[PDB]
Each structure stands twice: as structure tokens, then as C-alpha cells.
């Protein structure tokens, strides 16, 4: 992939960049609990056929 | 000593000069003189256009008339200057723009007239609708 930045193809001014990629680190991309299943159980009367 | 005074001012920007002999000093809103965008606060990365004297100069809008029935007037900026010379052209040719302003409101009369106008500059002057 061609590694260009804007100053390679247009005139640019100086900009002090403050943004960071902190929230797209692997750890942060995955730092959430996700539902992987729902399990059903019950507690019926003792007189049940089931 | 030389007679310099609060009331007597000269303002010069680009090819234009304003004089006044009955001023009441002048206001710098929130104590902040206009400035170009610092590198530490910059955001679009392309090299900006800065028209300088082509656009930073006094433009006079159409005059209005104050009578006993006048309730007041309003304008918005940059909108009121959208059709003003090279300021207007630079505004419409570019997606983005920023600008500060010197606003000079003029209204003379006589020592036998009376009346008082409040001249307010409001950041984000959102106005109410008719519905």
C-alpha cells in the first residue's frame, strides 16, 4: 500500500496533532462483555409428568 | 497634553479608514483581539487561504432609518458580509472559514435630539420563529 500523507500531494500547513488511537487497540476493541448464550432452567411442582 | 482622547479615534484596515470625534472608547469582546488559528488548535490540514487586506477592510452596509416607531434591527455575521467584495468570494469558494470583525455603528444627530441605542454583539444569536 502506498504510505502517503497529505503533504505528499497537496500543500499543507503545520498542525499539532492531538488525536490518538487509544480506543482501537486490540484490548479496547474487545473490552466488553458480549452475550454468548441464554440457558433455560425451571423448578416445577413434584406432581409433574415432566 | 497633546489632546489625545477617548472620544476621538481613527481605525485603519486595508485601504480603509474610519474617523470619529464622539466615541465612547471602544470594546474588545471578552478581552480577546482577533487572531489567526494557532497550530496547536488547528484542524483542516490543507494550507489555508488568508486574504489579508483584500478582505480585512471596512465594508459599509445599506443604511437604515431610526424613527419613533422603530423597534430594532438585527444582522448575522458572516451572513451580512456574504456579498462583500473579496471577503464574500473567499467565503463561498471554501468549505471552511473563520473570521473576527471590527463592527462600527454610526448614528449622529444634534445637541437637541435625544435617544439611546443598545448595540449588542451576541455569540450564537439564535432567534425565535413565527410558528
Q: In the beta sheet, which residues pair with residue B9?
A: B20
Residues of chain B neighbouring A13 (CB-CB closer than 8 A): 39, 42, 45-48
Residues of chain A neighbouring B48 (CB-CB closer than 8 A): 13
What are the cell numbers at B44? 483542516
Q: Which residue of A has its CA nearest to B38?
A: A15
Q: Which of residues 24-43 of B touch A (CB under 8 A)?
A: 39-40, 42-43
Rounded-to-integer distance, Cα A35 and Cα A42, Å = 21
Q: Is B60 exposed, middle or buried (0-12, 13-18, 19+ CB in 10 A)?
A: exposed
* Beta carbons of A14 and B42 less than 8 Å apart: yes
What are the cell numbers at B88? 464574500
Residue identified by cell 471577503 is B87
Residue B51's Cβ-side half-sphere holds a number of Cα atoms within 13 Å equal to 19
What are the cell numbers at B12? 485603519
Interface membership of B96 toward A (CB under 8 Å): no
* Beta carbons of B39 and A16 less than 8 Å apart: yes
Phi, psi of B9 (to 5 degrees): -130, 155
CA distance A31 to chain B (A): 30
Interface membership of B6 toward A (CB under 8 Å): no
Q: Which residue of A has its CA nearest to B40?
A: A16
Q: Are B55 and B37 in contact (CB under 8 A)?
A: no
Residue B12's Cβ-side half-sphere holds a number of Cα atoms within 13 Å equal to 2
Rounded-to-integer distance, Cα A4 and Cα B36, Å = 28
* Beta carbons of A15 and B42 less than 8 Å apart: yes
* Cβ neighbours for B31, distance < 8 A, ≥ 6 positions apart: none
What are the cell numbers at B47? 494550507
Instruction: Strands of A1-50 (E only): list them.
Output: none
Q: Is B55 exposed, middle or buried (0-12, 13-18, 19+ CB in 10 A)?
A: buried
CA distance B48 to chain A (A): 7
Instruction: Strands of chain B (E only): list them.
Output: 9-13, 16-20
How many other CB atoms sit within 10 Å of the CB of residue B61?
Answer: 10
3-state percent breakdown (helix, strand, coil) of chain B, nearest 5: 15, 10, 75
Quote the DSSP letter at residue B63.
P
Listed by the residue before each break, gaps in chain B with C–N over 2.5 Å are none
Amino acid at each position: 500500500t502506498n504510505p502517503l500523507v497529505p503533504s505528499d500531494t497537496v500543500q499543507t500547513r503545520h498542525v499539532v496533532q492531538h488525536r490518538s488511537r487509544s480506543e482501537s487497540s486490540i484490548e479496547s476493541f474487545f473490552a466488553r462483555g458480549a452475550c454468548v448464550t441464554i440457558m433455560t432452567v425451571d423448578n416445577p411442582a413434584s406432581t409433574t409428568n415432566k | 497634553a497633546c489632546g489625545y482622547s477617548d472620544r476621538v479615534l481613527q481605525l485603519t484596515l486595508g485601504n480603509s479608514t474610519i474617523t470619529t470625534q464622539e466615541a465612547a472608547n471602544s470594546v474588545v469582546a471578552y478581552g480577546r483581539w482577533p487572531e489567526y488559528l494557532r497550530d496547536s488548535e488547528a484542524n483542516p490540514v490543507d494550507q489555508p487561504t488568508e486574504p489579508d487586506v483584500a478582505a480585512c477592510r471596512f465594508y459599509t452596509l445599506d443604511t437604515v432609518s431610526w424613527t419613533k416607531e422603530s423597534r430594532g434591527w438585527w444582522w448575522k455575521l458572516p451572513d451580512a458580509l456574504r456579498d462583500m467584495g473579496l471577503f464574500g468570494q473567499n467565503m463561498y469558494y471554501h468549505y471552511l472559514g473563520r473570521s473576527g470583525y471590527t463592527v462600527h455603528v454610526q448614528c449622529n444627530a444634534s445637541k437637541f435630539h435625544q435617544g439611546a441605542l443598545g448595540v449588542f454583539a451576541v455569540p450564537e444569536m439564535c432567534l425565535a420563529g413565527d410558528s
